[model samples]
Target chain A: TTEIDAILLNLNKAIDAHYQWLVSMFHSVVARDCQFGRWIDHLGPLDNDELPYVRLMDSAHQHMHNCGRELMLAIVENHWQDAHFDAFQEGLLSFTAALTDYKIYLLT
Target chain B: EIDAILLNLNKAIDAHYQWLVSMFHSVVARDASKPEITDNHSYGLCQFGRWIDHLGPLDNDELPYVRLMDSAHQHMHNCGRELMLAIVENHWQDAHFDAFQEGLLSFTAALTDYKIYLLT
Candidate 1:
């Protein structure tokens, strides 16, 4: 609970930063450049047997990053499609939900 | 205005996701509450669904998008319930979790189409 609680805070911070970057329309970084992304990269690989939720989290995390990158490119290219924004937003929701599931799994 | 409705739609979807996530906690903590979990768990019975139902028939154009939202929402809830029950009954395997994850992603992708269609 202690480690997860700390990591969860960091994750929430990164999520908020992404939100701010989108809302402020400022210069932004892609998934690989974000703090959470960097942290994820350092984790090597989670054992699927003991930590099934981590595997799920990794997938959702990647999906969210892909959606964010797609949103960034679309906006920069003047495509400015609503679908682009929608995908990013949904990505955020799904990723957060995945993390919640992981937290619950850890508890049980 | 359409803008307000769009905002509301986003909020409603977010709320739905939160509620679904909460089911995991309720199940793990052994809390028998939340009829949304123990009950029939229909999409229409959820708060988000109630909002959609209350909205009723609007103009002619957005109806298509509305249907898309309805179908995706229903599927996601069904998928969620299936996964949750698996855990409750101690029958869920890794395959079940993987399938649930895939189901959720598909549901969100469907919502992506419907939402952007509404905006455009």
Candidate 2:
């Protein structure tokens, strides 16, 4: 029972982070496009709770999606084995699914 | 000419779909922490463990739509709706679409970035 609760709570936290990240992601995009750079101030500086959501969005997520594959390859190895890593993958997908349902909520 | 345009549109849609699926599948390469699927081999296309959390305690009968809608369908629907709106409203050519795509990719990147940064 306790274990189940912990997992659900962690999942909720992950969901929250995803939303916050969504907000920041939007802000960053808009800011980078602005000529004045004032948009940068609009990013995460304002204190929207969803912006911090990515801090724990995934436990072992590693990538250099913007930096190119070379950076991704240089990243250190994880202690978790292949099976464990796969489990994390599964968790994330489920998390994304759960968070998807909540996307509308974030809009409001 | 309209049919030719439709063909190009379909190609773009397919490319977008491929990108979406690849991104979804990429999670398997990262650390997905949920153990429910650890026992069940759910991968790609919203396939996975039972929807116990969303459905609440259940009976022998299975109603996956309830689970799917609550868990994943809405976002997928929203994604579809937005895309439809884009096509209907011609948003793809608008500056907003680039901003939207940049924001989506950036969040995906930052979240992954933060998670790795969490390690140490």
Candidate 3:
């Protein structure tokens, strides 16, 4: 349980790094390139007890990446602005929130 | 000709999403009677399936984008069945979510694209 929490801490670190990379490189980062995606790629599945959380986490994770994909495209295509910043941040919040629930379930 | 079918296709898509949302909750709660099919492989029973029937006859399905919507019905049905299996049997993986989500996107996009294909 705590181990999963520990992993989440690192995953959170990767999110920050990717966001910075986006700002500096101005390039879209594929989801698989991120630590989170790599984690899921190798992670086949969880126990039934944990499976429900897995679905939410996965869905939120994809939405986050999809939002980032659009943001980077907009930046490179025309210009950059806060127009989509809210959306990206929404993804960030949603992903973290889902993960938090999963970690809590892991503990209990 | 395509107007009524297109409109019906749109409704079918809406009803399908309704099922997805309802079923997702059923699985997450892991509740009893967890999203049974209640029919004999009757994917054709839904609005989307029946909507396909509304598609008038054609030569290998030229106009009305018959094949596009037809294949999309398969897309939606197969994925829906597989998704239920994964949940019902508790056989799961990261790919299950990916497959389910991709199936949904494909079907919806196919419907909209066919909708446009009709307009064109």
Candidate 4:
């Protein structure tokens, strides 16, 4: 039981760490690129219409954020106490896939 | 024998980083912002987490791979930072930039094949 507890704790930490890093990373890119004609020189203006990349980035960020929140809720509720580890682990795994998708599209 | 594993692991990491650099160029060419490649360390951790779950427990022999991974992780972390610093410091724009970019892309392809080798 102690081992299981430790595993759960570590998994939770990994998820949170990844989430924080990703948020910081995505925020910096968006903020920096929004600076006057830094990379979006061809685009008319930020307000004119959402660029394709921006829309995709925004969507990916939201998905990961939502997943993180859900995972947090489960973790805080002590879901592991009831051996609900599967859901928690599965949630984080799916988030990782979402992150992979984000990486693929962000590069595109 | 272990040195071979370590060497291959380092090569894999370099390939992964090169692939990232090439992808960044593609993003810029499309008039898009570059994605943070450093954030990939987190992605790598995510993969590591899944791998850990699959394995369930660590044995003595796995220590080598763990240490190798840790070393590669730190090395690649520095690589990303150094690349970013160099790019901003020199305002690097030249023919060599094109040459290196082309070479990195080629390295990226070779790294993809290396991944298959690791799996096998």
TM-score of each prediction: 0.49, 0.26, 0.46, 0.27
Model 2: CA > 4 A from native? A1-4, A19-23, A30-108, B1-61, B64-75, B80-120
lDDT of 1 by residue, B69-104 (tens): 777777767766776677668685556555645555
Q: What is the DockQ of candidate 4?
A: 0.02
Task: State the TM-score for model 1.
Answer: 0.49
Is model 2 an incorrect, acceptable, medium or high docking prediction? Answer: incorrect
Report lDDT per candidate.
0.61, 0.35, 0.59, 0.40
lDDT tens per residue, model 4, B1-120: 544543553345333433443333332233332333434443254333234235446567555555444444444444544444445455433433344343433433343344344545
lDDT of 1: 0.61
Candidates by lDDT, descending order: 1, 3, 4, 2
DockQ for each candidate? Answer: 0.06, 0.04, 0.02, 0.02
Q: Looking at model 4 chain B, which ten-residue stretch has the lowest summed lDDT?
A: B24-33
Sort by TM-score, top down from the best: 1, 3, 4, 2
How high is the lDDT of residue A57 in model 1? 72
Q: Can you write out model 2's per-residue Cα lDDT over B1-120, one digit (the tens) per residue? A: 334423432233223333343332334244332322222322222322132234366444334323432334223323433433444344533454445444444433433333333333
Please list all clashing residue pairs in model 3, or write none if there are none.
Answer: none
Give one digit per residue, the lDDT tens place, for model 3 in B1-120: 666765576456436634653453344345442222434354677767775667566765465466766776676567656756765776855565566566656666566566556656
Winner of 2 and 4 under lDDT: 4
